[PDB]
């Protein structure tokens, strides 16, 4: 979710994924195929979902934590400077990236934990399995 | 895909043009089709062959056959559906050929069979729509089955004898 301590603000720009592996931490995985800002709360909205579906195992990984602070309109005006450091925290996610990847549970028993989760994300994804063997 | 074609005696086809004209013991019947829809009789039985094969075609195909085969048992045996009047005081009499419902409506329901159809009643609690054209008959027993559908609590009104009408069941 939200980071522990830092600076306070940022900016905005984009271009395809860079350090978003594939297989690791599990057998099955989910992939973000589109530029977006994943809202920390839009992740809980994912974790907590997948959870339910898994009585146990935990084998769910969220390797996308939110390293970013976005701001807001303190009502309207425009006569003042930067504002709302505390609107919410975001996790800029680029294509090909991997936010999810479960492990242990049966294919379908995983081809749902994602399906659902997908339903609360702003972007279009797809699930993945293996053959991932770059660096280790 | 469909091909078999039983063209029993009574018949008489005449693929003359697109009006695939027919004549039998029940009365000459005519059914049009597609021209590029290839068909006629070979040896004894019959068959409707086709040009291309996939959809726009194999459809009309599986259509025509089924259709002609009808006119067969058509002028050959004639068609007749048997309806059932069900419920308290539900009953049909008649008038000449006119089917006469009596199904709870503050005033009686008269139904008149069209140009090639005929009404019949055994016990004023069972019905029948015979005739030549398989369609019309269905296309009318409907109009009779519609004067009153069966209810989801007692399945009243007209229905199809071996009709499966489970009841919601209320209070």
């Amino acid at each position: 979710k939200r980071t522990k301590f830092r600076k306070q603000f940022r900016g905005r720009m984009t271009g395809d994924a860079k350090g978003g592996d594939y297989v690791a931490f599990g057998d099955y995985g989910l992939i973000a195929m589109e530029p977006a800002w994943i809202k920390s709360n839009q992740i809980e909205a994912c974790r907590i979902v997948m959870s339910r579906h898994f009585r146990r195992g935990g084998k769910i990984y969220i390797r996308i934590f939110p390293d970013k602070p976005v701001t807001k309109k303190p009502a309207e005006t425009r006569m003042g400077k930067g504002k709302g450091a505390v609107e919410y925290w975001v996790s800029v996610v680029k294509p090909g990236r991997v936010m999810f990847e479960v492990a242990g549970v049966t294919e379908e028993q995983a081809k749902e934990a994602f399906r659902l989760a997908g339903h609360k994300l702003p972007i279009q994804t797809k699930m993945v399995k293996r053959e991932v063997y770059d660096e280790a | 895909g469909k091909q078999p074609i039983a063209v029993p005696s009574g018949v008489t086809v005449n693929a003359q043009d697109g009006v695939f004209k027919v004549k039998g013991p029940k009365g000459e019947l005519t059914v049009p089709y597609n021209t590029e829809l290839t068909v006629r009789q070979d040896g004894d039985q019959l068959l409707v062959e086709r040009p291309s094969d996939a959809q726009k075609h194999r459809a009309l195909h599986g259509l025509t056959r089924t259709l002609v085969a009808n006119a067969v048992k058509g002028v050959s045996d004639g068609y007749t559906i048997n309806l059932e009047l069900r419920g308290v005081g539900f009953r049909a009499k008649l008038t000449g050929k006119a089917l006469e419902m009596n199904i709870g409506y503050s005033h009686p329901v008269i139904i008149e069979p069209p140009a090639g159809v005929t009404f019949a009643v055994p016990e004023p609690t069972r019905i029948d729509v015979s005739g030549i054209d398989k369609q019309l008959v269905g296309q009318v027993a409907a109009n009779v089955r519609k004067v009153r559908k069966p209810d989801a609590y007692h399945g009243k009104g007209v229905r199809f004898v071996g009709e499966q009408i489970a009841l919601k069941a209320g209070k």
């Binding site: 395809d16 690791a24 090909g96 242990g104 993945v128 | -």
Partner: protein, 175 residues
Amino acid sequence: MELTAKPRTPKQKLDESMIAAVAYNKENNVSFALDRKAFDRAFRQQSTTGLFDITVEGGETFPALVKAVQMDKRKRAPIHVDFYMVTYGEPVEVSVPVHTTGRSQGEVQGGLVDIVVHNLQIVAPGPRRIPQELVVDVTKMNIGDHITAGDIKLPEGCTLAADPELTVVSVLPPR
């Protein structure tokens, strides 16, 4: 795998279903360009522990091994491969995966068994005879059993490159 062309230019393939790799050793670093589909159905099987028939156009069979591979983001499709021409006595080292079998005495207990480190790498594989796999015990493993490198039975000869006490598989608890 009959890779044929091998020019700096790939036009005549970038559209036409073909990957594009390079295989070498230190002697010959022949330019290359095989077919998509083939290496596509191929590598899947042998993986990085599977040397194959490399009769480049003209006919010059060569033995090598899938070293590293770089596939596309957005599209799980691969783009560039690097083959490492097989040796004779020693190749370098190989990337070998860990596997389980037999039910775990932890699984039914209430927890699950986790393969901490999927594929594992070992010092000195020994060309000609390189494990295209590696099966490992798990049964014994209960609530908090950790297996490491120093444990996995070796295929007679092979020497474990990774550090011994590093946990390979651990049967995790519930929740």
